Structures are given as C-alpha cells and as structure tokens.
C-alpha cells in the first residue's frame, strides 16, 4: 500500500529470534542487506537477547557506535543489520568471534570460534554467469559477487571466502557423499551426507540426506548447504550437538542423566 513497510510487529517477527510476546508492540525490523528478512538475525537481537551484553535497545546502539561490532571483518553500525548463516561476528574488545550456524533446534546458536577460523567463511553458490565485458562471476548465498571464479565452480557448490580479501580459497562440488547442513524447513539445523539427489525438471529438486545416526530425511535442494567434503570433515566447527536430531524422549533421557 503506497510503499515499503518500515515496522515489524512483535507477533509477526521470525519465531527463531525467540522474542517474548509482552515486551512491547514492535520487533526489530532487519534492514536490507546480505540476508533475507525471515532468515536473518539483527545485531540488536544478537547483542541484547542472546549475549545479554546490552540491557536494552539504547545500549546496543551505544555499543555499535564505538566501532566494536564487526560482521564478516567489517565494522557495522546498523543495529538492525541482517546477519545471517555463516556470518562471522567479531567483538575484539571481548576477544570473541562468533559464527552464525543453525543448531538442531532451529535457532541461531551462540557458537564461539577461534580467531584462525574467524578469518574465513563459506558461501553457497546461487548462480554463475557472465558479467559485462565477458567476465564470469559467482553470486553466493549472502549476496557476494566474486569475479574470475574457478571455471569448475557451478551452482549449489560451496566456496570458501578469504573474508579479508573477499576471494575464493577453494570450493566443494555438490555431489553424493558431501557433508551438508539444512538451512530451511522443519529439518533446519540438521547435518548429514547426501545420499541421492532426485531431479524434477520444472519443479524443486529433492535431496536425500542420511544423519550420522543413520536417520534419513528429504529436503528441497534450496535448503541444502554443503559444509564439508565428506562425513566427519566439516570446513567449519559445528555447534554443540553436531546437527543430530534427538527425539523428545531421547532429549528427556539425556537431560535426566546430565542433571543426575
């Protein structure tokens, strides 16, 4: 109606932010950025609701205006900056590096990483095509454009971004046996290997994935993110739980043993 919306009602916010109903009428509307609104995590939610470094929205803006917060190696001062999957958040004042990887419960885990691993990131190749003057380029899942890619790189592959020069270190071809995390749907956060890719021309390709516990699930190819060259060899540290989904009875049994 007459133009873009600028507000986000609290009840209409993405459920994986885990916002409470009664704290207010509105929720942080993520800015335009590398990641989609529904699949992002604004830095205000991360710094206040997750880390609890800031006590309110006024304080998170004070934190970011002092140049502390870096996303993917660059300083961001937008409190609603849409950080997303595989993004690296650096707070060098606290000497902490985080990577936004989904946990098996469907939410963005608070996953601390080492400084050496915080020097790169993975991006799923969305498309490969030729730019002006006939220069090929790759578009990753976070909107990055890398020119002069390896001519073997195709869509659905994963590239390793140097994240300081923005170049591609190396890549993983999409094929059977590759390690995968699911980035959408009800199997979000699960980790397994590709068993069989089922093609449907004109529709949505489906990928069969086998868990480390030999559980098999099917998901759309658009929700498949290659994260490793084979089983047990991920290119990034996985969050606690290793993307293995436990039944509710198993979780109840595990919690009983953990607490005695």
């Amino acid at each position: 109606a007459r133009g873009p919306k600028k507000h986000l009602k609290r009840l209409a916010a993405p459920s994986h932010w885990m916002l409470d109903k009664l704290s207010g009428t509105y929720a942080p509307r993520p800015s335009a950025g590398p990641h989609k609104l529904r699949e992002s995590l604004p830095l205000v939610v991360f710094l206040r609701n997750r880390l609890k470094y800031a006590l309110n929205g006024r304080e998170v803006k004070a934190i970011m205006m002092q140049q502390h917060v870096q996303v993917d190696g660059k300083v961001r001062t937008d409190t609603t900056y849409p950080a997303g999957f595989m993004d690296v958040i650096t707070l060098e004042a606290t000497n902490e590096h985080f990577r936004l990887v989904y946990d098996v419960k469907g939410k963005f885990a608070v996953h601390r990483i080492s400084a050496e691993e915080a020097a790169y990131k993975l991006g799923k190749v969305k498309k490969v095509q030729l730019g002006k003057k006939g220069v090929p380029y790759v578009v990753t899942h976070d909107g990055r454009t890398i020119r002069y890619p390896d001519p073997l790189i195709r869509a659905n592959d994963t590239v390793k971004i140097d994240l300081a020069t923005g170049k591609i270190d190396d890549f993983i071809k999409f094929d059977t046996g590759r390690l995968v995390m699911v980035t959408g749907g009800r199997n979000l956060g699960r980790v397994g290997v590709i068993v069989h890719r089922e093609k449907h021309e004109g529709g949505f390709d489906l990928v069969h994935i086998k868990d480390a516990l030999e559980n098999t699930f099917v998901t759309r190819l658009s929700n498949v993110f290659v994260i490793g060259t084979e089983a047990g060899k991920p290119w990034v540290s996985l969050p606690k739980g290793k993307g293995i989904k436990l039944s509710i009875s198993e979780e109840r049994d595990r919690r009983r043993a953990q607490q005695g």
């Binding site: 609890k52 800031a54 002092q66 502390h68 606290t94």
Partner: protein
C-alpha cells in the same frame, strides 16, 4: 542487621566498560535495603568507587527478608557518566535534572514557530511596523 549481598549471573562487559550482575539481598529483620546503602556496600566489597556503582530494579519477595535487583559496576566514574542513563545519574546525584517546559508547552511552541518563515526578529519587527 547483617545485610548479606550475593551476586550471580556476572558478565564482564568491556564493550560498555562495566561489570553487570544480578544482586540478591538478604535483609532479615529489615524492610529492605535502600539503593544508596547497597551502592555503599557493593563499593566496599569490590573496592570500587561508589559513583561507579549503579543498582536498579529491586523487588522484595513475598513474605519479606530478601530482595533481588540488578547492578552495574563501571571501571571508572568517567565511564559511568558516559554510559549510564540520565535518569539514573539524577538518582545518584551525579547529574542535575534538566529543566524543560511541559510536553504540551513544547509542542505548542513548536507549532507556533511553524507559522513563521525566517527569523523571529524580522517577524516581530514587521508586526510592529504593521501595527504602527
């Protein structure tokens, strides 16, 4: 009478140059402990300046004898004056309550100025000429 203070969920927050924690106050035979007295006690416990300590949001449990709140300890008084909300500094006497007209008067003055283009001095000078 033997006020006991416990701190839990302590987080070191160099982003805002402070340490932040939940405060548990055990005050048997005592209605509660005033914020001013808690700041004095907390300053002695952690050997910090009293003006670098901020406490707020206290509530006494049902039946009394215990209160819970939130506390902040800054690395310096200068850091506290930089990151603390204005209303808390007025509570602690570190700042003066800014004096402004009521919200109705500020809005009414703003709408009166919307009817003037240019400086106020010109507008009143022109009005004087018109009425003279």
């Amino acid at each position: 009478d033997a006020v006991t203070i416990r701190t839990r969920k302590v987080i070191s927050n160099p982003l805002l140059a402070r340490r932040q924690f939940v405060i548990d106050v055990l005050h048997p035979n005592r209605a509660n402990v005033s914020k001013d007295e808690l700041r004095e006690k907390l300053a002695e416990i952690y050997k910090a300046e009293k003006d670098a300590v901020s406490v707020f949001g206290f509530r006494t449990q049902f039946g009394g004898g215990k209160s819970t709140g939130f506390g902040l300890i800054y690395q310096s008084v200068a850091d506290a004056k930089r990151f603390e909300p204005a209303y808390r500094l007025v509570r602690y006497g570190l700042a003066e309550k800014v004096e402004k007209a009521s919200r109705q008067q500020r809005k009414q003055k703003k709408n009166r100025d919307k009817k003037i283009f240019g400086t106020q001095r010109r507008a009143q000078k022109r009005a004087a000429r018109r009425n003279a």
